[PDB]
Amino acid sequence: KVYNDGYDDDNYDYIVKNGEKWMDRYEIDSLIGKGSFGQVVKAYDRVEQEWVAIKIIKNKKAFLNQAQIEVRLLELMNKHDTEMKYYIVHLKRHFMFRNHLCLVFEMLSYNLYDLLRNTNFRGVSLNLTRKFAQQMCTALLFLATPELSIIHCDLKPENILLCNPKRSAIKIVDFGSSCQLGQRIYQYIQSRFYRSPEVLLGMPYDLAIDMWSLGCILVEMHTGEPLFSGANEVDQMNKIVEVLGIPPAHILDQAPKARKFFEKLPDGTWNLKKTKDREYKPPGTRKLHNILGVETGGPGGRRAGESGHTVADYLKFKDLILRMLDYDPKTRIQPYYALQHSFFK
Ligand SMILES: CCN1CCN(Cc2ccc(Nc3ncc(F)c(-c4cc(F)c5nc(C)n(C(C)C)c5c4)n3)nc2)CC1
DSSP states (O other), X not given: OOBGXXXXXXTSOBOOOTTOEETTTEEEEEEEEEETTEEEEEEEETTTTEEEEEEEEOSSHHHHHHHHHHHHHHHHHHHTOTTOOSSBOOEEEEEEETTEEEEEEXXXXXXXXXXXXXXXXXXXXXXHHHHHXXXXXXXXXXXXXXXXXXXXXXOSGGGEEEOSSTTSOEEEOOOTTOEETTTOOOSSOSOGGGOOHHHHTTOOOOTHHHHHHHHHHHHHHHHSSOSSOOSSHHHHHXXXXXXXXXXXXXXXXXXXXXHHHEEEOTTSOEEEOOOOOOOOXXXXXXXXHHHTTTTTTXXXXXXXXXXXXXXXXXXXXXXXXXXXXXXXXXXXXXXXXXXTSGGGO
16 A cells, blocks of 8 residues: 555655655655654755755645745744844745645754753853843834734743754744734643743733743753643642742632632632642742852852852842733733843843
């Protein structure tokens, strides 16, 4: 039995062959990534003499349709970013090849997990975190351009790639999960560790959900470890609550899924639910002040007396993160204002 004249496996994926040449132009090197959508391969573009990443979408209508939306968002961004100055990997071109949609990007070689793994998950410096944070806030600034109003919806270390000159810069990839404000209203979205309270609570959401993800990611960049590593949605919300306390009553009163996590008392206040069975630190007592080590030399005490890691520096970082982790999406800090924060001065 053959699929797509022998080009596909039994799962609608193009059968990648190291060394194959596509259209006398792309010399396929190796598989670099894979997922439900298809595959990403490393290839050498002989015409432009440069390494590229090619995202090969499955020969399957559902994934083709998803990726056609992705292409339209990338092309929209290209129309607003002729200088490629916003830390988003640029779509160079797209084409159909043997019944697969192919998106071609400049080739980057590492993600943020790779960088953290090289620190043995001890985290990078506050100085490097500051540079990456400014770059990510600049990307979010661009996405909130009114005509764009793009919600990435899947910010996580795997979708943040490193630029080849090392410690210079990161760039965002994977807009296959993204939508525009008021175009898709899917409810179980974001990667769980980076999932905002509004999404957990089943409430309406906007571009502020990406700023929540970014706050979580920035803490993880500096500490080496995920801030909120929930094994399921209840564990996820409970780990958020350990750090930030019970969400405001005016939010829980409007939340479809409030009762998945909390119970309203006759007093009108909200508490965590309890179970006949896990055990959590009391609400708000796992202080970000101590996660970051503001007064104790940073994470693990490893930054004691290091330039750019003074108590004053840590207090500005802590303040920015808490502004990104505001429970209220209407008052959570927005990209332009984050970029004006004293942490970046
Ligand atoms: C077990 C981990 N293995 C080995 C380590 N490896 C890290 C890694 C990841 C990516 C690259 N290279 C690269 N360069 C430019 C690009 F634009 C994309 C790109 C574009 C897209 F549109 C994507 N859409 C999705 C879903 N992905 C995912 C693959 C992130 C996209 C990636 N990728 N190099 C290394 C991961 C796999």
